[PDB]
Amino acid sequence: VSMRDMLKAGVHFGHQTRYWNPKMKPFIFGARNKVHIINLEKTVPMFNEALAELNKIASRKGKILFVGTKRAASEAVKDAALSCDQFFVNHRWLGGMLTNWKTVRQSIKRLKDLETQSQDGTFDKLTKKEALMRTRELEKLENSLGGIKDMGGLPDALFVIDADHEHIAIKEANNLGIPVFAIVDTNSDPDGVDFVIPGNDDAIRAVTLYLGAVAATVREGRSQ
Amino acid sequence: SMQDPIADMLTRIRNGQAANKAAVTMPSSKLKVAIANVLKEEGFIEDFKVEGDTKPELELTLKYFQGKAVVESIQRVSRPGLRIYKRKDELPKVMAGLGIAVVSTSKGVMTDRAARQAGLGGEIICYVA
Amino acid sequence: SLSTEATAKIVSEFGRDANDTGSTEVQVALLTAQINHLQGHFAEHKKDHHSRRGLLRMVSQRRKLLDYLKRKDVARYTQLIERLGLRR
RNA sequence: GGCGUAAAGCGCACGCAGGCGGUUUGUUAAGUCAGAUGUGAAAUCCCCGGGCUCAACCUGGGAACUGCAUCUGAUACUGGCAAGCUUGAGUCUCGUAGAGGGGGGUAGAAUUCCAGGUGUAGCGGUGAAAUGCGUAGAGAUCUGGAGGAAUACCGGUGGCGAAGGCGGCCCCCUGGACGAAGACUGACGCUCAGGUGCGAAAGCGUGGGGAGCAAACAGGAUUAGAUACCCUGGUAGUCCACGCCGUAAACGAUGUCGACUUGGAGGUUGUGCCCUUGAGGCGUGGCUUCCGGAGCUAACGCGUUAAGUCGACCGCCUGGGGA
């Protein structure tokens, strides 16, 4: 949140001037070497407001859903969402995880049944061909739905990295009225998000800074 | 060529409102300033200022409520190709009274309800809803 | 078109100053000079329609300037049309 | 209510009548507005009652008759008049790019033809053939000459032009566009029925010219037939001068003029700034190609060069045939 730590983390950096979105004009400070520079004076108050609303949602019995699938922010999202008893989607977002929850609930049930019969059940009726088949199905289903297995229903807030990369999740949350907290870069569309946090979403240290701040605020919210 | 500057002012307001512009600028005129006064006193624009002496430039500060346009519709009624004059008993009411109709009566430019209370008719400049 | 010296001469004899190059009299005189000069070119090049379009542009511009001058001040209009030899 | 594709933008432009017209002051009170007066026949329409036992019907009173004229005022807007102003529109200075137009000259490559040398049996053409040319020496090759037409490479969703269109090089005459900084005139403007002008190709008239190509035409093929596609020739024509014709899927199937509305990548042509580092970067105009946002659209798609939001004027459409 500290603008010095932000500027040292690489938050102010943006994409090239070609790929920019004109809707991101209020949050752009300028350009250097044909890449956009995000205005941190605009970034820190919006990030603080987003953190305040996230803390409210956490303290009011809420479920946060951390969404980010880029190879830069996958493991970071996993660590952040596990560090606060939350849920994450760090791999491919299945089209309809939220709007078609009544159908992916069955896949969650299947994943849970498979992992219980593998670990606690320990069928041992292997056949050495259906066993490896079931383990591969379990690993696919876990890489797809491993973060939201203990969610139960739809979350109350989405924290998205690279709002352009995750337009499907944002559109689903907007269809369901769930507030969206997205790290919107200079090339992304800030229309479908509620709490736009204009900052770099490609550098790894920037997303670790964002996720650490969000994890801290949601933990302090959990602990009231 | 420029044959209707009042319709041009209305079009500038409409296009600046649709583009979420903060303020719109245009060459000034007495009738433009009167219509801008009528719009400001009715609450459709925030403020207006006239800058310059030999070439006055009128600048209207557009108004938004919920990130939405305050001026939903603005149309030119009386135009150079067809002039529209109305008597006081047939003055139009826009949006069943929720909108205003800028009327140019012999006592200056005013709204349709002000011209009705004053017992006057005249040229229907525009409809603002 | 007209040379610089001929244009300067016309501006001087038809203008209220050596810099009054925009007066209606100066414009009409310059257009008349260009038309009279082009007359000889088109006597020899009767199939030059592309240049005759610019000639007719000059003619119509001079006509509109003369109409404006006659509507503005008829005395200067008469002085101009007698000094230039117009009125068909 | 419409005109990109469903019917509908004149092929393009100039322009008279007409329509509309930047901005300020004064004046008038023509349009406009307000009030009053006169009139707007009665019946009818409508409202409240009355009489027919009810109704139809009859009838009292009122409202209405949205109109016209006159008189008295108002002056915001439109109009008239007078004086202004510079931002629209033009003039001048200096340059820039361009297949813009008209006239004359010239250059090289190639096709064809004529004459000659070498040389010998084929050449040409096709899916295959044949018609055709060739022992009278073809085709091939070499040399010289004649004539006409068009300008390889450059060459490019490049440039110029109102449109149609414009392509070697040189000279002569000539139109438009754009840019820099100023000076000047001061609404002189936009559109335009009728009118006039330009208007691909084909076609027509007169006089030339005629290499190549090629309607018609002839022959050889193919075919059931083949008045065609294919082949061998070939006249008009294509070319030039001067007239006529006035039509095209004359297309962006998108009239002209002006204002406003997020962006990206290019092309072309000026101009300004900076140790010019560089064939550099950053601005600022003109024209132009592709994609795409809001918006619009029946959709396709258009999208700052709008088919978005508006204003002025014009042309056009009203089911398919007949036509």
Side-chain angles (χ1 to χ4, degrees):
Chain A
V1 48
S2 147
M3 183 202 307
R4 304 181 236 272
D5 294 358
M6 256 181 182
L7 195 139
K8 200 188 326 223
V11 163
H12 63 283
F13 284 118
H15 289 272
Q16 297 200 66
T17 59
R18 323 157 45 124
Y19 315 108
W20 84 313
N21 204 290
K23 297 180 179 180
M24 294 298 295
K25 202 168 187 293
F27 319 109
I28 283 177
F29 175 72
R32 241 196 280 113
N33 313 287
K34 303 242 161 23
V35 308
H36 272 332
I37 298 299
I38 312 178
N39 189 19
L40 298 188
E41 259 95 1
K42 278 265 198 174
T43 294
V44 307
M46 307 181 88
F47 198 20
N48 267 324
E49 182 185 0
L51 291 169
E53 182 67 19
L54 245 12
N55 167 267
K56 274 162 203 173
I57 295 265
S59 296
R60 196 237 294 108
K61 278 302 183 264
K63 288 169 293 188
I64 317 292
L65 171 61
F66 291 71
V67 185
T69 86
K70 304 223 302 293
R71 295 268 269 288
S74 34
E75 321 91 1
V77 153
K78 187 172 190 178
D79 301 326
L82 286 180
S83 152
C84 43
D85 270 339
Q86 294 296 339
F87 330 93
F88 54 93
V89 179
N90 68 117
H91 285 127
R92 167 188 148 75
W93 170 277
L94 303 191
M97 271 193 182
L98 298 187
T99 52
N100 194 21
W101 168 259
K102 51 196 143 306
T103 317
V104 314
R105 166 205 310 170
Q106 329 297 334
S107 309
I108 295 283
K109 181 170 331 151
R110 175 58 173 168
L111 156 73
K112 279 178 166 173
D113 293 348
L114 276 193
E115 70 170 11
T116 60
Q117 83 182 38
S118 147
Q119 214 46 277
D120 204 349
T122 59
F123 58 103
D124 188 36
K125 301 120 192 26
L126 313 165
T127 323
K128 312 147 34 162
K129 195 101 41 173
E130 81 94 8
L132 286 103
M133 221 62 35
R134 276 212 178 109
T135 52
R136 295 202 69 218
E137 182 197 327
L138 157 73
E139 208 61 60
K140 293 191 251 162
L141 221 47
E142 184 143 49
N143 272 160
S144 169
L145 296 158
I148 62 171
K149 61 201 305 175
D150 314 289
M151 184 180 276
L154 313 166
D156 216 340
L158 267 83
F159 187 67
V160 185
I161 311 284
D162 197 316
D164 203 28
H165 196 249
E166 329 281 337
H167 56 276
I168 294 180
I170 293 181
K171 189 207 61 215
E172 294 188 46
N174 291 337
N175 281 341
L176 295 181
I178 301 174
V180 187
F181 304 76
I183 303 300
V184 184
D185 210 346
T186 55
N187 70 327
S188 306
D189 196 12
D191 253 29
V193 310
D194 282 47
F195 297 82
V196 175
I197 310 164
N200 183 263
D201 49 16
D202 288 77
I204 317 195
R205 34 183 176 185
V207 317
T208 58
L209 171 133
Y210 301 141
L211 288 166
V214 175
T217 201
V218 66
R219 252 180 295 185
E220 305 175 291
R222 297 297 300 181
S223 320
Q224 271 264 300
Chain B
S1 48
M2 178 74 68
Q3 312 190 30
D4 199 2
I6 299 306
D8 183 51
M9 169 184 66
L10 310 189
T11 291
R12 283 174 129 110
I13 295 171
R14 200 189 301 107
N15 295 2
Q17 220 90 353
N20 294 323
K21 283 290 194 165
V24 293
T25 299
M26 67 202 71
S28 151
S29 159
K30 286 208 325 295
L31 190 54
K32 285 184 186 175
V33 165
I35 301 166
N37 240 324
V38 174
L39 289 180
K40 176 191 171 179
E41 305 278 290
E42 293 312 290
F44 289 108
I45 65 169
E46 262 170 33
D47 202 17
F48 76 101
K49 74 188 324 299
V50 187
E51 284 248 0
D53 293 68
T54 192
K55 292 156 56 182
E57 214 87 20
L58 174 71
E59 188 218 35
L60 320 175
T61 300
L62 310 171
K63 205 180 183 176
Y64 308 88
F65 187 41
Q66 323 269 32
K68 215 173 252 273
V70 161
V71 175
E72 319 277 331
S73 64
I74 176 156
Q75 325 165 13
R76 181 85 140 109
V77 176
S78 211
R79 44 179 186 85
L82 177 57
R83 297 286 175 182
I84 303 295
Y85 311 106
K86 298 292 181 182
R87 303 198 292 262
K88 59 118 170 164
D89 262 326
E90 58 192 18
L91 280 180
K93 36 165 47 67
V94 190
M95 251 191 187
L98 309 170
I100 73 163
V102 174
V103 181
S104 187
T105 72
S106 34
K107 298 305 178 177
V109 169
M110 53 186 67
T111 36
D112 77 272
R113 77 172 330 183
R116 211 135 37 195
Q117 293 170 1
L120 285 175
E123 177 170 349
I124 314 301
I125 294 289
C126 73
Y127 290 161
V128 195
Chain C
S1 270
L2 286 185
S3 35
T4 300
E5 301 95 30
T7 314
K9 182 166 183 55
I10 292 163
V11 169
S12 50
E13 59 189 18
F14 272 95
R16 311 317 303 168
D17 193 356
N19 296 259
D20 185 11
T21 74
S23 171
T24 316
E25 289 75 45
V26 175
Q27 295 193 45
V28 169
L30 288 170
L31 289 171
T32 309
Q34 279 146 12
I35 290 164
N36 297 336
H37 177 44
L38 300 297
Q39 294 300 320
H41 160 78
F42 288 124
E44 218 258 351
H45 287 301
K46 297 183 284 294
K47 294 265 138 282
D48 198 4
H49 308 293
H50 288 73
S51 308
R52 197 135 39 190
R53 182 175 147 88
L55 171 78
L56 300 176
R57 181 195 251 109
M58 282 187 290
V59 170
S60 64
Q61 196 176 344
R62 182 187 63 175
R63 189 60 241 161
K64 288 175 177 178
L65 284 161
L66 282 171
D67 290 352
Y68 161 76
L69 188 57
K70 180 177 188 176
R71 180 227 315 153
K72 211 55 159 50
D73 188 348
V74 53
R76 309 160 48 191
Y77 168 76
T78 52
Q79 299 313 304
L80 188 70
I81 63 178
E82 311 206 40
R83 184 136 75 122
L84 286 166
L86 294 192
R87 219 64 303 254
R88 300 288 182 268

